[PDB]
Amino acid sequence: PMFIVNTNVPRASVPDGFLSELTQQLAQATGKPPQYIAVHVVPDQLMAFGGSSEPCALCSLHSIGKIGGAQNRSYSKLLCGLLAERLRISPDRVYINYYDMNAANVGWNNSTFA
Amino acid sequence: PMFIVNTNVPRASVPDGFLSELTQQLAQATGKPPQYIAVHVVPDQLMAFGGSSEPCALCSLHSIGKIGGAQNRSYSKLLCGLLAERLRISPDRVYINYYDMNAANVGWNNSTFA
Amino acid sequence: PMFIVNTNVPRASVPDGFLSELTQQLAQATGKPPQYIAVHVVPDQLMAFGGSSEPCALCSLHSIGKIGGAQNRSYSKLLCGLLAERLRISPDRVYINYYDMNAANVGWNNSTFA
Numbered sequence: 001p002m003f004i005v006n007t008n009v010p011r012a013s014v015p016d017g018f019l020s021e022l023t024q025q026l027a028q029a030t031g032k033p034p035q036y037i038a039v040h041v042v043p044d045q046l047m048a049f050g051g052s053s054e055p056c057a058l059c060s061l062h063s064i065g066k067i068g069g070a071q072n073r074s075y076s077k078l079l080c081g082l083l084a085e086r087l088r089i090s091p092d093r094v095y096i097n098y099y100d101m102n103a104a105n106v107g108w109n110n111s112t113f114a
Numbered sequence: 115p116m117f118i119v120n121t122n123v124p125r126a127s128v129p130d131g132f133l134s135e136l137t138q139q140l141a142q143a144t145g146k147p148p149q150y151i152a153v154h155v156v157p158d159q160l161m162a163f164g165g166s167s168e169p170c171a172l173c174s175l176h177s178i179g180k181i182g183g184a185q186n187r188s189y190s191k192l193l194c195g196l197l198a199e200r201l202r203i204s205p206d207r208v209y210i211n212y213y214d215m216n217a218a219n220v221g222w223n224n225s226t227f228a
Numbered sequence: 229p230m231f232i233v234n235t236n237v238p239r240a241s242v243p244d245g246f247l248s249e250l251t252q253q254l255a256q257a258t259g260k261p262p263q264y265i266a267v268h269v270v271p272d273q274l275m276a277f278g279g280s281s282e283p284c285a286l287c288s289l290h291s292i293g294k295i296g297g298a299q300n301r302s303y304s305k306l307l308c309g310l311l312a313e314r315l316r317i318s319p320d321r322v323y324i325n326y327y328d329m330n331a332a333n334v335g336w337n338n339s340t341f342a
Contacts (some may be wrong), residue, residue, distance in 0.1 A: 001323075002286060002323055004156045004286070006276060011274075013256070014274070015227075016169075018283075019274070019275070019276045020279055021276075022274065023279045024279075034278060035278040035279070036278065037278065037279070038275065038276065038278070038284070038323060039164065039275065039276050040234060040273060040274070040275040040286055042273070042274070043273070043274070044158070045154060045156070046125075046128070046154070046155045047133070047152065047153060047154040047155070048133040048134070048137060048152070048153050048154070049147055049152045050137075050148065050149040050150065050152075051134060051137045051138075051149075051151070052262060053133070056152070058116060058118075058154060059153055059221075060298045062325060064159060067219070068218070069218040069226070069228055072218060072219060072221055072226050072227075073221075073225050073226050075221065076222070076224055076225055076226060077224045078148070078222035078336050079223075080222070080223065081224075082173065082222075082301045083243050091223045091224055092222070092223040094221070094222065094223065094265065095116055095152055095221065095222055096220070096221030096222075097176060097215065097219065097220060097221075098218075098219040098220070098221065099219070099325075101325060102220075102298045104296070104297045104300055104326075104328040105295070105300060105325065105327070106323065106324070106325060106326070106327075106329075107287075107301075107303065107304030107307070107308070107322070107323065107324030108304070108319075108322060108323055108324070109305060109308070109319045109320040109322070110157065110295075110304055110309070110319050111301050111304050111305065112300050112301050112304055113299075114297055114300075120237065120268060131280075132258075158246070159268060159270070160239075160242075160268070160269045160270070160271075161247075161250055161266070161267065161268045161269075162247040162248070162250075162266065162267045163266045164262060164263040164264065164266075165248060165251045165252075165262050165263075165265070167247075172230060172232070172268055173268060173335075181333070182332070183332045183340075183342070186332060186335060186340050187332060187340050189335065190335030190338055190339050190340055191337070191338045191339065193315070193335065194335070194337070194338045195338070197253050205337045205338045206336070206337040208335070208336065209230055209266060209334065209335065209336055210334070210335030210336070211230075211290060211329060211333065211334060211335075212328075212333040212334070212335065213333070214333075216261070217238075
């Protein structure tokens with residue numbers, strides 16, 4: 001699985017352990033080993049949400065399976081809670097795009113997972 | 115909706131009210147409430163288009179509905195127009211990928227839109 | 229076609245000509261003329277792969293057609309090979325997402341390809 005956060009929160013306000021915290025929580029959330037989880041945080045971004053420049057985040061979660069109606073409602077609660085406590089972002093200023101990827105469309109280690 | 119621009123144009127060339135303008139034009143183009151429109155501009159990028167490092171842009175628009183054949187042609191005219199007028203990027207050096215997202219695959223404020 | 233690579237490798241480790249090489253190799257691999265190939269390289273990123281901060285990359289390839297089972301394995305061998313040789317990234321620390329785009333959902337030069 002792959003999780004990306006783009007935010008206007010400055011770099012110095014991203015805690016040093018945030019990437020490892022995300023990795024561990026997403027491994028439990030998805031039921032996949034932490035070795036398979038990749039995380040990417042992009043601070044200091046020029047963005048607005050509803051026309052306002054208060055702190056906000058635009059995110060995406062890709063995974064081969066473990067994506068769906070009930071699961072995505074649970075992920076949103078987990079991720080909003082993490083962004084609220086660690087980055088101080090209000091949860092109504094968070095978007096997360098979920099992607100259920102086909103194994104043939106994910107490359108890794110010179111091949112694909114198909 | 116969510117709109118992202120990645121470009122090699124320098125940060126200093128992005129006009130002050132550019133995020134505000136994108137928000138208002140996208141609300142009028144999609145008919146979506148401006149309170150739910152997010153915009154994101156990433157300048158100073160290392161990019162090439164057709165092998166050339168002249169000004170270019172790679173963009174995306176995600177939306178629940180309001181995506182389709184005729185609508186996407188109209189969005190493309192509007193967005194290339196703004197990129198040409200505001201950032202001086204030639205329209206033939208711009209790609210825009212459009213994504214019709216399922217309401218269950220868009221997370222917001224501890225839930226999804228389904 | 230559009231190829232994007234995000235990596236934690238420093239900008240000074242990207243060799244001169246890297247974007248030209250990607251443009252030429254992807255033109256040959258996809259069969260499309262190089263005029264229509266776009267490439268985007270984002271170094272110095274804050275990311276982790278498996279909870280480790282060793283060099284890694286998160287990538288995507290978008291194409292109108294030329295996306296499929298055997299084709300995507302061949303792209304993965306080519307692209308992991310380039311990232312290993314030029315950027316010194318191990319292939320088992322690379323993810324590439326593949327997207328088969330519908331022509332009606334790709335804007336260019338004030339309109340769409342369909």
